[PDB]
Amino acid sequence: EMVETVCGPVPVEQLGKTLIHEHFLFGYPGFQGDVTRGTFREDESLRVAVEAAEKMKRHGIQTVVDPTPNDCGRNPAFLRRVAEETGLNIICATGYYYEGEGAPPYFQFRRLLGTAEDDIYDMFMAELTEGIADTGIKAGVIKLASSKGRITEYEKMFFRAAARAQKETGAVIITHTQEGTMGPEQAAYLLEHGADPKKIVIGHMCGNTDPDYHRKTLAYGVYIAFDRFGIQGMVGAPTDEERVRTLLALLRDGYEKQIMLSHDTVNVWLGRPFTLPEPFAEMMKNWHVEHLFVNIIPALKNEGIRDEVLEQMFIGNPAALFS
Amino acid sequence: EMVETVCGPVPVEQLGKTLIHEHFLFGYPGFQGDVTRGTFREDESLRVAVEAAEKMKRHGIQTVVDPTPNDCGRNPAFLRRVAEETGLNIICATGYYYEGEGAPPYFQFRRLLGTAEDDIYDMFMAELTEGIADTGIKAGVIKLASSKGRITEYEKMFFRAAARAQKETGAVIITHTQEGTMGPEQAAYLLEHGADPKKIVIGHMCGNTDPDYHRKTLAYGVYIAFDRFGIQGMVGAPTDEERVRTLLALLRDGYEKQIMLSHDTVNVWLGRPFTLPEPFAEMMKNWHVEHLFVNIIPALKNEGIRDEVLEQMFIGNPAALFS
Ligand SMILES: [Fe+3]
Ligand SMILES: [Fe+3]
Ligand SMILES: [O-]
Ligand SMILES: [O-]
Ligand SMILES: [Zn+2]
Ligand SMILES: [Zn+2]
């Protein structure tokens, strides 16, 4: 009946229209070391974040899952400020990034000590049931991530710890797949360790344009997310045109109750400001929190997708997921 | 004539007896993500650090270089507190750890943007000549590090940025070599890019037990450090007995003016507390800041090493290095 948001427990029935995957803040591991030229401008960042939140509210969004990994600048206290200000529900995560772009040296060390998996489990349990540092904010989801073409042994420690923690807490698991790979593998591995498919979201599934890969992942009974609308050119990404074509094939096949949509936006980048070169920038020009509503949804409607299906995805699915 | 310490500029002539490589705080990249169970206990940590500082002072140490990488928990403000308390000079660094155990994803990303080398350079220049964040503390050395058997392209950006910055500032460069490899390569690569051998310390040279490897590194005119006394079995390290044998061979060959000594201790570990499993842990039992003075130095003296040579290493070499 309840889910933990950054402002405390909230009835699942009150979540309403939800974006399953967006980042208010995000930094690549190592951004901390660039503190002198890349310092965190709090007031400006909160402005940007609050504005992003208001744009979502304007399209009827009431809830956001922000699955920023512990090692990528996750900041629950900041999230709580964004939420207090806007009345938005924000659910945060506990978890580490994938080994390739995460910060593995620390838990790799604890693996040599032979305590890693249990320490990770302990960390999950603590942040889900007690609180994150001294914020007294609890995570509402566990965040897992795998590398391209592989779930590494480092990554598997997290997967195994997450299944254990989900068995103990009933927590929702949300994943990152890298460049359209390992969806089926992720679902299978989690299920083999007793994870509950109705509590799992395989993320970045839109990274793969082959509907059979999707059906293979969907066969496990898990949710899948097309959560990178707007992202074009970078991190191996397909086009929105392909995202839509794939999504339409699935919806037409009756998979609406297993699909959620989002953009994976990064509203404030941690570390030093940067600008993409307009080979990529203009390809990435619709990567913002309104893109789904302004561009994608109308396109789906013009292809015969009905309001009931849209509602299933944005409202009914998150409610079922968290309950 | 001056060098930047955490308490401001200091006459090089006043540095006195110096440990070239010790860490008051250190954490493996990713420690930040374990904040809930691994929170930073400031008061206790400052105690431990101040004590470590006093033990060094008691053995006549006046200056310590703490070359903790930016991405491994470097905390200049904390260092400044340790120094204010004890009167010890502490010189800190600017630099990132090696790829394999650092946090590469951030500057790897800026490489794709094609600005990495210049941003790193910009960071060096800023921390050496302006200050680190808002602490107003400037780094006195640039820290570089390479992987086992290789200096990676990621690492080479830092090496190239450091040569540039040293040409502009005359800053001292101090390196990490991984498991006794790349000493000669590091010196060659830095020299090829116009770095000054008399301002370079190739570190962890004690990781290799073959004197010809050492002579090859020493031929570039650089300093080397045997800076891991007390560390045994772990990270591929040899024994102190081997460290001593190798060091004796070099001193007997007249290399005293190019060698410095330290322990590479980690006085406070960042992230969650741990204990090394008991067979490794006893191997590592003398890994503490008094080991050199209580155990190693008397052994060198019993092998005929004179006071003048010891003084050359602990006092004369640091003076020449920083001037
Ligand atoms: Fe994401
Ligand atoms: Fe070190
Ligand atoms: O992501
Ligand atoms: O080190
Ligand atoms: Zn992701
Ligand atoms: Zn080192």
Side-chain angles (χ1 to χ4, degrees):
Chain A
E1 177 189 343
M2 308 297 284
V3 65
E4 297 287 344
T5 73
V6 295
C7 280
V10 160
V12 171
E13 192 169 23
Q14 306 187 358
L15 294 186
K17 203 183 184 171
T18 293
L19 285 165
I20 195 62
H21 199 123
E22 312 286 341
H23 306 272
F24 288 102
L25 299 186
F26 186 99
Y28 281 111
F31 72 91
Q32 309 93 331
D34 193 28
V35 55
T36 292
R37 292 289 187 244
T39 189
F40 172 66
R41 300 168 161 83
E42 180 96 32
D43 285 339
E44 175 64 6
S45 297
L46 184 61
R47 278 191 265 270
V48 173
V50 161
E51 182 44 43
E54 296 297 346
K55 286 179 185 178
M56 300 185 297
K57 269 173 58 192
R58 266 172 253 146
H59 289 281
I61 303 306
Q62 189 40 43
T63 291
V64 185
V65 179
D66 176 330
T68 304
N70 295 19
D71 56 339
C72 299
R74 176 196 60 184
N75 189 338
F78 181 83
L79 297 184
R80 179 163 58 202
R81 286 209 235 168
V82 177
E84 276 175 354
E85 174 110 45
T86 57
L88 214 53
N89 301 310
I90 304 173
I91 302 173
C92 69
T94 173
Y96 274 52
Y97 211 28
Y98 77 96
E99 181 185 342
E101 277 178 328
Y106 177 80
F107 278 112
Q108 288 288 41
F109 182 67
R110 307 198 80 92
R111 168 140 70 124
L112 284 163
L113 299 174
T115 55
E117 199 188 299
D118 290 322
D119 294 334
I120 295 162
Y121 169 84
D122 174 52
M123 169 188 79
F124 286 170
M125 294 300 302
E127 306 197 318
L128 286 162
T129 68
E130 297 167 42
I132 297 168
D134 300 314
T135 63
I137 294 163
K138 307 180 185 173
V141 300
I142 301 169
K143 175 58 177 300
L144 291 178
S146 62
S147 297
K148 177 188 177 177
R150 195 176 293 267
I151 311 182
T152 72
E153 297 315 298
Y154 169 87
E155 298 158 5
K156 291 185 181 155
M157 305 193 298
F158 293 85
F159 275 68
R160 293 194 298 270
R164 290 173 37 188
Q166 175 185 91
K167 271 132 83 192
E168 293 277 5
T169 62
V172 162
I173 287 168
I174 295 191
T175 79
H176 162 108
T177 63
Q178 183 61 14
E179 299 168 64
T181 62
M182 305 314 273
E185 281 79 3
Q186 279 189 0
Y189 197 75
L190 285 171
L191 265 43
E192 282 187 28
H193 292 80
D196 181 355
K198 304 261 158 275
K199 287 288 192 177
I200 301 176
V201 186
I202 309 300
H204 312 338
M205 281 293 295
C206 60
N208 191 293
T209 48
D210 181 16
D212 276 314
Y213 168 85
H214 296 258
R215 296 193 185 94
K216 198 167 213 331
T217 307
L218 289 159
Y220 293 87
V222 293
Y223 294 89
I224 64 167
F226 283 53
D227 48 27
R228 285 177 158 183
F229 287 100
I231 298 179
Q232 290 179 127
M234 327 205 58
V235 298
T239 64
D240 282 346
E241 166 168 338
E242 286 167 291
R243 284 193 175 87
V244 156
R245 180 179 305 133
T246 315
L247 169 60
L248 282 171
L250 299 175
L251 294 175
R252 289 169 171 156
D253 266 347
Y255 288 109
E256 62 198 308
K257 307 217 293 192
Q258 284 177 270
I259 301 179
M260 291 175 292
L261 308 189
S262 216
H263 312 86
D264 199 5
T265 59
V266 174
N267 292 281
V268 175
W269 276 101
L270 303 172
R272 200 184 304 217
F274 66 92
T275 62
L276 291 169
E278 302 218 44
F280 305 93
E282 190 269 5
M283 284 204 299
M284 295 283 300
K285 74 177 199 299
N286 291 309
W287 187 38
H288 47 47
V289 290
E290 276 187 312
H291 181 43
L292 266 174
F293 313 105
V294 170
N295 309 108
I296 300 313
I297 289 325
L300 298 170
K301 304 238 295 164
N302 295 330
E303 292 268 17
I305 305 304
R306 310 168 64 110
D307 284 317
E308 273 70 47
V309 170
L310 294 177
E311 276 151 30
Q312 183 56 54
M313 295 192 288
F314 281 100
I315 303 170
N317 290 353
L321 170 74
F322 281 98
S323 75
Chain B
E1 175 189 345
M2 307 300 281
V3 63
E4 297 288 346
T5 74
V6 295
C7 278
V10 159
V12 171
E13 190 165 34
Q14 303 183 1
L15 295 184
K17 201 181 181 172
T18 294
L19 285 169
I20 198 60
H21 199 123
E22 312 286 341
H23 305 268
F24 288 103
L25 301 182
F26 184 99
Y28 281 113
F31 71 90
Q32 305 96 327
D34 195 28
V35 54
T36 295
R37 290 290 187 243
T39 189
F40 177 65
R41 303 168 159 83
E42 176 98 31
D43 285 339
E44 173 66 6
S45 296
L46 183 63
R47 277 193 261 274
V48 176
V50 161
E51 185 42 44
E54 294 299 346
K55 285 180 182 177
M56 299 186 294
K57 269 175 58 193
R58 267 171 253 147
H59 290 279
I61 298 317
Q62 288 180 167
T63 297
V64 183
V65 181
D66 179 325
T68 307
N70 292 21
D71 54 340
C72 295
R74 173 197 62 181
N75 189 341
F78 180 84
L79 296 183
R80 178 166 59 204
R81 285 205 226 173
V82 176
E84 277 176 353
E85 174 109 45
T86 57
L88 212 54
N89 303 312
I90 304 175
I91 301 177
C92 70
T94 172
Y96 274 52
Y97 209 26
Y98 74 99
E99 181 157 8
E101 279 184 294
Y106 175 77
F107 277 116
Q108 287 289 40
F109 182 66
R110 311 197 77 95
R111 168 139 70 124
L112 283 162
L113 298 174
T115 55
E117 199 188 295
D118 294 324
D119 294 332
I120 298 166
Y121 169 85
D122 175 51
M123 172 186 76
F124 287 171
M125 294 298 303
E127 307 200 320
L128 288 161
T129 71
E130 297 167 41
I132 298 165
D134 297 316
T135 67
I137 293 162
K138 307 180 183 172
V141 296
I142 299 164
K143 169 65 168 296
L144 292 178
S146 61
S147 300
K148 177 185 178 179
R150 193 178 294 262
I151 310 176
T152 70
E153 297 315 299
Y154 172 85
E155 298 158 4
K156 290 186 177 158
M157 311 190 300
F158 294 86
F159 277 68
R160 292 194 298 271
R164 289 174 40 186
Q166 173 183 93
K167 272 131 85 192
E168 293 276 10
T169 60
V172 164
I173 288 172
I174 295 191
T175 81
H176 163 109
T177 62
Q178 183 60 14
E179 300 165 66
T181 57
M182 306 315 275
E185 284 78 3
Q186 279 190 357
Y189 198 76
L190 285 169
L191 262 44
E192 280 185 25
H193 291 80
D196 184 357
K198 303 262 159 273
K199 287 289 193 176
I200 299 177
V201 187
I202 309 300
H204 312 336
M205 279 293 291
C206 59
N208 190 292
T209 46
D210 180 18
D212 277 316
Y213 171 83
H214 296 259
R215 297 196 184 92
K216 199 168 211 325
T217 309
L218 289 159
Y220 292 88
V222 295
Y223 290 91
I224 65 168
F226 281 54
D227 50 26
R228 283 176 159 184
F229 289 99
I231 292 180
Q232 295 178 141
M234 293 296 278
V235 301
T239 63
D240 281 349
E241 165 166 339
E242 286 167 291
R243 285 191 175 87
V244 159
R245 182 178 305 134
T246 314
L247 170 60
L248 282 172
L250 296 177
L251 296 173
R252 287 163 175 167
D253 266 348
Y255 287 108
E256 67 196 306
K257 304 218 294 193
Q258 286 173 271
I259 299 175
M260 292 175 295
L261 307 187
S262 219
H263 313 85
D264 199 5
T265 59
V266 173
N267 291 290
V268 174
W269 276 99
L270 303 175
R272 196 189 303 216
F274 69 94
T275 57
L276 285 181
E278 209 191 45
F280 276 119
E282 186 267 351
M283 297 214 79
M284 297 283 298
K285 75 176 197 299
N286 289 309
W287 188 37
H288 48 49
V289 290
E290 277 186 311
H291 182 41
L292 270 172
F293 315 101
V294 172
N295 311 103
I296 299 312
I297 292 325
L300 299 171
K301 305 239 294 164
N302 295 335
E303 292 266 14
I305 304 304
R306 313 164 65 108
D307 284 318
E308 273 70 47
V309 169
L310 296 176
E311 279 151 29
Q312 184 56 55
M313 296 191 284
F314 283 97
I315 303 170
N317 293 349
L321 168 76
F322 280 100
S323 75

